[PDB]
Amino acid sequence: TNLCPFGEVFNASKFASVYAWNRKRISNCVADYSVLYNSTSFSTFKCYGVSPTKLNDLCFTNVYADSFVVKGDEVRQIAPGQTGVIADYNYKLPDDFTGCVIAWNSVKQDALTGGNYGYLYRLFRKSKLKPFERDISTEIYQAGSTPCNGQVGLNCYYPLERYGFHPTTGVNYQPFRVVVLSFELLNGPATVCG
Amino acid sequence: STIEELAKTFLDKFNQEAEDLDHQRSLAAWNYNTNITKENTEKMNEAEAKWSAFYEEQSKLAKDYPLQEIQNFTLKRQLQALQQSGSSALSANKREQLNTILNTMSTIYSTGKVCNPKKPQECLLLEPGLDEIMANSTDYSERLWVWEGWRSEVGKQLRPLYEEYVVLKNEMARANNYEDYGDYWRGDYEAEGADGYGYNRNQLIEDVERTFAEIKPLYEHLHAYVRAKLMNTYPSYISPTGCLPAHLLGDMWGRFWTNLYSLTVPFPEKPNIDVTDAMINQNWNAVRIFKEAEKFFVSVGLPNMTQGFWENSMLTEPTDGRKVVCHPTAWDLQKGDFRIKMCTKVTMDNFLTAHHEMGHIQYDMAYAMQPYLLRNGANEGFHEAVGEIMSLSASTPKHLKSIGLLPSDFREDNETEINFLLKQALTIVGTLPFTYMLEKWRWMVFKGEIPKDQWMKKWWEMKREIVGVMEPVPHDETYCDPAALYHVSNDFSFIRYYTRTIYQFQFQEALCQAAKHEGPLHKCDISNSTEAGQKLLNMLRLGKSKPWTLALENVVGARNMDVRPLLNYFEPLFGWLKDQNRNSFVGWNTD
Ligand SMILES: *[C@@H]1O[C@H](CO)[C@@H](O)[C@H](O)[C@H]1NC(C)=O
Ligand SMILES: *[C@@H]1O[C@H](CO)[C@@H](O)[C@H](O)[C@H]1NC(C)=O
Ligand SMILES: *[C@@H]1O[C@H](CO)[C@@H](O)[C@H](O)[C@H]1NC(C)=O
Ligand SMILES: *[C@@H]1O[C@H](CO)[C@@H](O)[C@H](O)[C@H]1NC(C)=O
């Protein structure tokens, strides 16, 4: 049995913006999850649905690792039962959730002295995403009754905006990278153990 | 769906985009201030242009949501604050006309210089030299040529400007549904809210008026006293019942009597409590000062500073060759980035200042939970008022002993106490009537109640009656003396110093009474008292989200201005001055 490539996801050089979060499926895998908890350079690490220690010698059937970059302030929304700007219109996790929320500060990498307006987030959406939905439509959001044909004007705004991280801002306004782990004992053949 | 719901949505867009561009503008200005290069000026102006552009546009659109339809005062406050166009509501061409006027005035004041008659070659400039003359000189005639010289070269010159200015501004405020310009400035204090907590822009004049009625006694007695002591310096010139000559008040306008302290010290043998040397002996560092302040705020219940404030600021002159501006300021760069710039020096002054640039920083941090529009003090008074009481607590000798700048066995006695209280009164009490009277001449000019011709006359009539000052050389209507003041000719409202000064003492009284204080209000130190701290916070967090009347009644239990705490701070000096003037005349004869 060959190792999970957790390492190539967590230590990846570039992260997707929250609104188009990057999802990797993990299969055919042995991995050491007690390594990731052993590390503790992670500001946040709140595995829900199942204690983190137990799962290292339990095998699982699919594993989905979603990574993205979000504002420090907002990491509190990547958890069941949370409604915020991110969880509402960017990455909702369901209530009956069995997985992890690993996150760390990324200031030294994802921040620029002067500005790193590369990451983005979606501020308007007609309705809340259903769990794990992804949405990357750049369609001009029409809140008015008056429809906007392509022109953004009053009561018709563009839906995404730039985070713009800076090295000097406060923690809450600092760029944290995030990885969410989903498990799926529902399929016949399991394929991810430790 | 409805107008308000759409309005919410608009705002959310705004707050979020605004916050980012304000971060960038402020960042640009901070690189300029701490690193003055032609390039960094270029970028500061570019970023400013972008910010101005953005704000104008968003304001136009914000008017598209009619205030009538919003039923959420916390939202309506944001809208109403965003909506008022001000200068943009005037038509275009008069905008460029006015702007050329205002820029021209400011350039005159800055380049204003008046030659010395005895040696015209050695002519002199205001801000570098003339302030020093007006602050140290003792010679009546020399001082005089400075007063009248400034007022003649500058006053005259600005007469035409200021009036067109009044016309363009009066018209502009009228465009905005404000009956005159002064009404537009009294807008700030207007506050609608839960019934009974609201405030009408008119009630400001009534409340400034009626509080000053309470203050006038104390002022009179300070006035008689200081006139008496001045008589001995200027025997030949001073009437023992007349108002004082304007130029003899330590500063070019007579705004602060602080520089008269040397001449009016009550007990000169007992010198005033200067812990500079003490600091210097313990080899204190600017940092050390700021840490001592921080520990103060923590002792009252308030968060320790952010590692960004402990990682980014300028707290000493750089001393690597890059020019900067010495003036101390507390910044909020809209994103959790608080910082202070201060060319600090090891003096008691800086120790007391830094406590209150930090009182700003701590206001900033308190209200940052609020949406970007509501992130400011409940009105123009509260910011500095709140960052002055810090330097009031830190000054007390009880505190100075507490932290080891004052030997444990310390003698605090009536003679030094009065010396101090009195210096306080020169600075604090001096400027109450000066200020109030100035802003009343401005208010009344704008309501057209002073016809053009009799500007100077009405002006000086008020300065004889209210401030008790003299107008040494007779000024006709060709002269224009109020424009000689920076705030007057650089288009700044001025009642903030009155209101702020009356607030700070209501605060310090509420907190002290809550820190279980025993005795004179003027020795109060709130340190180590978290009850007073949590109470202060409960108002600090509101920013502009609640009507400033409510922001106040939370701290001090009263919904309006009240001078009682001020009179109560100065009571020890009042009694002493009353008793000290029972054989002399108290009051001015307006002639
Ligand atoms: C990421 O890299 C560091 C340094 O090479 C290593 O210690 C850490 O275990 C790596 N993490 C993973 C998940 O491979
Ligand atoms: C000051 O500004 C110049 C350009 O304006 C820049 O090149 C220089 O590195 C700056 N120095 C510091 C210490 O910020
Ligand atoms: C402030 O003090 C608390 C308690 O000791 C500490 O947890 C916190 O980290 C301190 N502040 C900073 C910015 O380090
Ligand atoms: C606050 O308490 C500390 C510890 O007892 C003490 O050293 C300090 O002097 C106190 N400050 C005041 C103002 O009483």
Cβ–Cβ gap A124/B9 under 8 Å: yes
Half-sphere exposure of A192 (CA within 13 A, CB side): 21
A171 touches chain B (CB under 8 A): yes
Closest to B306 (Cβ–Cβ): which among A123, A157, A170? A170
Q: How far is CA B437 from the centre of its chain?
A: 16
Chain B closest CA to A145's CA: distance in Å? 7
Q: Which two tokens stand for residue B474?
A: 């007779």
From A170, A168, A163, select the one nearest A15 (Cα to Cα).
Answer: A163
- Cβ atoms < 10 Å from Cβ of B287: 12
Which atom of ligand 1 is nearest the CA belonging to A8?
14
Name which residue sits closest to atom 5 of ligand 1, judged by CA. A11
| CA quadruple B186, B187, B190, B191: dihedral, nearest 10 | -150
CA of B291 to the centre of ligand 3 (A): 13
Report CA-CA distances (Å) from B415 to B258, B274, B400, B409, B411.
19, 15, 19, 17, 11
| Cα angle: B304, vertex B308, B312; to 5 degrees | 125
Cβ(B233)–Cβ(B226) below 8 Å: no
Q: In chain A, which residue's Cα lies nearest the Cα of B27? A: A114
H helices of B112-139, in order, are: 131-136
Cβ(B459)–Cβ(B74) below 8 Å: no
Residue type at position B501: T
A141 phi, psi to nearest 5 deg: -85, 120
Q: Find out whether the beta carbon of B304 lies less than 6 Å from any atom of ligand 3.
A: yes
- DSSP reduced 3-state for B3: helix
Query: Is position A86 within any domain?
Result: yes
Distance from C-alpha of B532 to C-alpha of B550, rounded to nearest angstrom: 18
Element (H, E) at B147: helix B140-150
| CATH classification at residue A111 | 3.30.70.1840
- Cβ atoms < 10 Å from Cβ of A11: 7
Residue type at position B368: A
Q: In chain A, which residue's Cα lies nearest the Cα of B20? A: A164
Could you tell me the strand order of the sheet in which A2-3 lies?
A2-3, A29-30, A192-193
Q: Which two tokens stand for residue B346?
A: 């090891």
Position of tokens 């002295």? A113
Q: Find out whether the beta carbon of B404 lies less than 6 Å from any atom of ligand 4.
A: no
Q: Which residues pair with A66 in a beta bridge?
A: A23, A180
| CA quadruple A137, A142, A148, A154: dihedral, nearest 10 | -120
Q: Find out whether the beta carbon of B527 lies less than 6 Å from any atom of ligand 4.
A: yes
Q: In chain B, which residue's Cα lies nearest the Cα of A172? A: B336
End-to-end CA distance of chain B: 68
Distance from C-alpha of B521 to C-alpha of B512, rounded to nearest angstrom: 8
- Cβ atoms < 10 Å from Cβ of A187: 11
Cβ(A27)–Cβ(A62) below 8 Å: yes
Query: Is position A151 within any domain?
Result: no
Cβ–Cβ gap A162/B61 under 8 Å: no
DSSP letter at A75?
Answer: G
Distance from C-alpha of B447 to C-alpha of B205, rounded to nearest angstrom: 13
- What is the domain count for chain A? 1
Q: How far is CA B309 from the centre of its chain?
A: 24
Give Rg (Cα) of chain A: 18
Which atom of ligand 2 is nearest the CA belonging to B37?
5
- DSSP reduced 3-state for A26: strand
Interface test with A, best of B14, B15, B23, B50 (most A CBs within 10 A): B23
Name which residue sits closest to atom 3 of ligand 3, judged by CA. B304
Name which residue sits closest to atom 6 of ligand 3, judged by CA. B304
Instruction: Name the residue of B355, B402, B408, B410 to mutate for ligand 4: max ligand atoms within 8 A of Cβ.
Output: B402
Cβ(A165)–Cβ(A116) below 8 Å: yes
Phi-psi region for residue B356, left (φ > 0), alpha (ψ -120 to 50) or beta? alpha
Distance from C-alpha of A47 to C-alpha of A51, rounded to nearest angstrom: 6
Q: Find out whether the beta carbon of A7 lies less than 6 Å from any atom of ligand 1.
A: yes
Instruction: Name the residue of B27, B30, B35 to mutate for ligand 2: max ligand atoms within 8 A of Cβ.
Output: B35
Domain carrying residue A95: 2-121+162-193
| Residues in chain B, overall count | 591
Q: Which residues pair with A162 in a beta bridge?
A: A120
A144 touches chain B (CB under 8 A): yes
Element (H, E) at B182: helix B181-186
Domains of chain B, by residue range, sit at 3-71, 94-162, 276-393+497-569
Half-sphere exposure of B6 (CA within 13 A, CB side): 21
Phi-psi region for residue B303, left (φ > 0), alpha (ψ -120 to 50) or beta? beta
Q: Which residues pair with A64 in a beta bridge?
A: A25, A182
Cβ(B76)–Cβ(B67) below 8 Å: yes
Interface test with A, best of B63, B335, B339, B361 (most A CBs within 10 A): B335
Cβ(B573)–Cβ(B221) below 8 Å: no
**What method was applied to determine this entry?**
X-ray
Q: Which two tokens stand for residue B336?
A: 């959790």
Chain A closest CA to B543's CA: distance in Å? 20
From B246, B271, B268, B249, select the one nearest B260 (Cα to Cα).
Answer: B249
Distance from C-alpha of B182 to C-alpha of B193, rounded to nearest angstrom: 23
Position of tokens 């699982």? A60
Q: Which two tokens stand for residue B541?
A: 């967090």
Cβ–Cβ gap A144/B6 under 8 Å: yes
Q: Find out whether the beta carbon of B424 lies less than 6 Å from any atom of ligand 4.
A: no
Closest to A154 (Cβ–Cβ): which among B12, B61, B333? B61
Query: Is position A141 within any domain?
Result: no
Cβ–Cβ gap B10/A161 under 8 Å: no
Cβ(B398)–Cβ(B525) below 8 Å: yes
From B311, B314, B307, B308, select the one nearest B329 (Cα to Cα).
Answer: B314
Contacts of A28 (CB under 8 A, 6+ apart): A1, A2, A191, A192
Q: In chain B, which residue's Cα lies nearest the Cα of A115? A: B24
Q: In chain A, which residue's Cα lies nearest the Cα of B58? A: A154
Query: Is position A108 within any domain?
Result: yes
DSSP letter at B151?
Answer: I
Cβ–Cβ gap B23/A144 under 8 Å: no
Query: Is position A139 within any domain?
Result: no
Query: Is position A148 within any domain?
Result: no
Distance from C-alpha of B56 to C-alpha of B88, rounded to nearest angstrom: 7
Distance from C-alpha of B119 to C-alpha of B123, rounded to nearest angstrom: 7
Q: Which two tokens stand for residue B283?
A: 């080899």
Distance from C-alpha of A80 to C-alpha of A47, rounded to nearest angstrom: 11
Contacts of A188 (CB under 8 A, 6+ apart): A61
The DSSP string of B338-401 is EEEE----SSHHHHHHHHHHHHHHHHHHHGGGS-GGG-S-SSTTHHHHHHHHHHHHHHSHHHHH
Distance from C-alpha of B329 to C-alpha of B311, rounded to nearest angstrom: 17
Q: Which residues pair with B331 in a beta bridge?
A: B339
Cβ(B394)–Cβ(B524) below 8 Å: no
Query: Could you say which ligand is closest to the alpha carbon of residue B319?
Result: 2
Q: Where are the beta strands (DSSP E) in chain A?
A: 2-3, 22-26, 29-30, 44-45, 63-71, 99-105, 120-122, 141-142, 156-157, 160-162, 175-183, 192-193
For the annotated catalytic residues of B, the residue numbers are 357, 487
Which atom of ligand 1 is nearest the CA belonging to A9?
13
Q: Which two tokens stand for residue B495?
A: 């009642």
From A60, A55, A63, A48, select the one nearest A100 (Cα to Cα).
Answer: A48
Query: Is position A140 within any domain?
Result: no
Cβ(B108)–Cβ(B162) below 8 Å: no
Q: Find out whether the beta carbon of B336 lies less than 6 Å from any atom of ligand 3.
A: no
DSSP letter at B247?
Answer: G
Chain B closest CA to A144's CA: distance in Å? 7
Contacts of A143 in chain B (CB under 8 A): 6, 9
